[PDB]
Each structure stands twice: as C-alpha cells, then as structure tokens.
Design an enzyme around this catalytic site. Structure first.
Site, PDB file in Angstrom:
ATOM      1  CB  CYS A 217      -1.049  -0.069   1.102  1.00 27.05           C
ATOM      2  SG  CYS A 217      -2.516   0.829   0.607  1.00 27.05           S
TER       3      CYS A 217
ATOM      4  CG  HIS B 214      -3.687   2.727  -2.263  1.00 31.59           C
ATOM      5  ND1 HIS B 214      -4.287   3.850  -2.804  1.00 31.59           N
ATOM      6  CD2 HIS B 214      -4.681   1.908  -1.846  1.00 31.59           C
ATOM      7  CE1 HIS B 214      -5.598   3.697  -2.711  1.00 31.59           C
ATOM      8  NE2 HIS B 214      -5.863   2.542  -2.119  1.00 31.59           N
TER       9      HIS B 214
END
Lengths: 189, 189
Positions: B106, B126
């Site tokens: 992420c 992400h």
C-alpha cells in the site's frame, strides 16, 4: 440521523482477520464500532497470537446499547467461547427481539445455534463448521460466500471477510456508501 | 531446516488489516513472526483505531536477526513513521545487503524510497501512493496486484493483503505450502 453503532464481541481464540477486517471496514463507513472483550477489559490473544486491546469490556459495552449490528467473529475457540457465554446469549436474544441485525462469520454462526437465535434462516459457515451448525436441522445451509436472510447475516472465512463487512455496511448505510468504501480497498471484485 | 522468520514492523497509524492479514497467514504457513513495535514495547494505535500489542520492541527484535523477510505494512501515517526511522533504514539496508526478501504493501513501499532501497526494481503501491513512490523515477511502476522483482515484493491495498501474504509464503516456503495455506481461507481466487 445519528451514526449507526456496531458491537464486535472479541473472545480468546477469535480469528483476528475476521475481527479486524469488519472493524476497520465499518469504521471506514462511519459506523461507531465498539470492540468489546468477552472476558473483561484486558488484551485478547487471538487464534494466530495477534493480541488486540478491546475498547471496553463486554460487561460495560452491553450497558451502552442498543446497537444497530452485533458482530460475531469466527475462530473455532473464539466461537466456542461466544457459545458458552450467558452474556452473549442475552445480547443476541435482545438484538433478535428488537429486530436488529446480527452478523457472524466462519465458526461464529455456531454461537447462533448455541443461543437458539434465528432458527429457520438460511445460513452459511466455514465448510468445516457446517456439521456443528446443522446439528438438529434448525437452519438451511448455503454455500454463498455471504448469506443474508433478513436480519441474520453470515459468511464463510477469512477470505470472505471483506464481502461480509461490506454487506454489513450496505445493510446499515446503503449500497452507495458500501461502494464508496469498497473502491479504495483494491478488492479484486 | 529451521523454520523461516519474519519481522513485521508496526508503527502508529499502520493499516491494521495490512498488519494482521500477513501476520496470521505467515503463522499459518509455520513462519516464526515477530510483530515489532517501532516506538517500543507498548500497544500501537492503528489507522482505524484497532490497538495491537506488539510481541517486542523493534529495538529488541532487531538484535535477534537476521530475518528471512522484513514486512512493511501500509497506512499513510504508518508508512511516514517507517520512512522517518533511522532504525528501519538500518534494518532494510542490512536485509538488502544480505540478499533477503523485503515485502511492503500500500503506502509501505514509500519507505523503500525514503531509505534508498531496491532502486531500479518494478514496484506497485496503492494508487494514491504512486506519485510519492515515483518521485525521482527510481522505480518502474506496476499495476499488478502483487509485484515481485527479485527480493523486492510489493502490493497495493487492504484488498490485496491475502495475495501479498501468500506471495511471501510462496517465496519462503514454496508454492505447495502456499496452496495448502490458501485453501482453508475461502478466498475467491
């Protein structure tokens, strides 16, 4: 409109993924979540040894109801602890009597059986928990990843936890909020 | 053959799903996982207010290396804490120097940038962390849900955490163990 409220009941041996994914996703949806320790206020040793500090004891959190959803994580030993608890029985019977949502995942639905909640509903569980749940034929079994029969919302395993959590969000806050919460998660579908 | 060992570095503001899913899945694979608190031994307040008690402080856990994998959860503020830490820098440079796996999810991969780790690798993050990761063009960006370029293993979000964790398992313990760990999880694919 006040924010919705969720009670997540956390017992020793709970599946920590099935605890944290619904808590986090519900908080992303703006739901006020209370992680309540079955045993008291102290940290809880989950099934894979993650240690989670509850927000409150269940004894205290139960005084602050009612809640729009009561959530039962799975984990074989966590669900066995939920199933043995007279406090859980009382909370679930109150929630059922007030026509409030009850959501349980993996082995978690077997606590519904123990407390005689929601008989006659369609339910799913983890495959390995099917026989326990189906003892007596009090429910009808489903293989859907998430199953919702009215106010009884069930699901199968760690890998269905996002779907389960988003189904709770949809039930409480609607499909549009669920879709908005879903997109930043990078789910495959 | 001794069991493999993983160091999961847990900072305030970490994404709790991205912490717990890899810890739990790696423990299911028989990996000895140490959840190490960046700040010390005390409980850690994650991004969505789940509070996790680490197994050890990072200060102590770093003395007990080396580890077969170092894992960096995401969460924007957790990754910023990892990126600012001189202790994290030292651990990652040691792991890189010994040709050991580093796994980040992420916003977590942005700590690799901060510590100048793995330049020239293909990485994912992400979507919202892409610009930070790509500042200077030191990596090549990927949209794969999990990306592995040698010993740098990256992934995108909460919803890729199972895939990320299983990729770590496959890298350490092989494809067959990963498949065996995967089946009881009830993943959709």
């Amino acid at each position: 409109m006040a924010s919705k409220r969720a009670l997540v009941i956390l017992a020793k041996g709970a599946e920590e993924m099935e605890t944290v994914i619904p808590v986090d996703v519900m908080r992303r949806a703006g739901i006020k979540v209370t992680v309540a320790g079955l045993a008291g206020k102290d940290p809880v040793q989950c099934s894979r040894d993650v240690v989670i500090c509850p927000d409150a004891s269940l004894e205290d959190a139960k005084k602050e109801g009612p809640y729009d959803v009561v959530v039962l994580p799975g984990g074989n030993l966590g669900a066995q602890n939920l199933s043995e608890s007279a406090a859980v029985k009382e909370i679930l019977k109150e929630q059922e009597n007030r026509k409030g949502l009850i959501a349980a995942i993996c082995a978690g639905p077997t606590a519904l059986l123990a407390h005689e909640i929601g008989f006659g509903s369609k339910v799913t569980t983890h495959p390995l928990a099917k026989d326990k749940m189906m003892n007596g034929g009090h429910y009808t079994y489903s293989e859907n990843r998430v199953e919702k029969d009215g106010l009884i919302l069930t699901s199968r395993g760690p890998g269905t936890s996002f779907e389960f959590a988003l189904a709770i969000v949809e039930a409480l806050n609607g499909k549009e909020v669920a879709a908005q919460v879903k997109a930043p998660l990078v789910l495959k579908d």
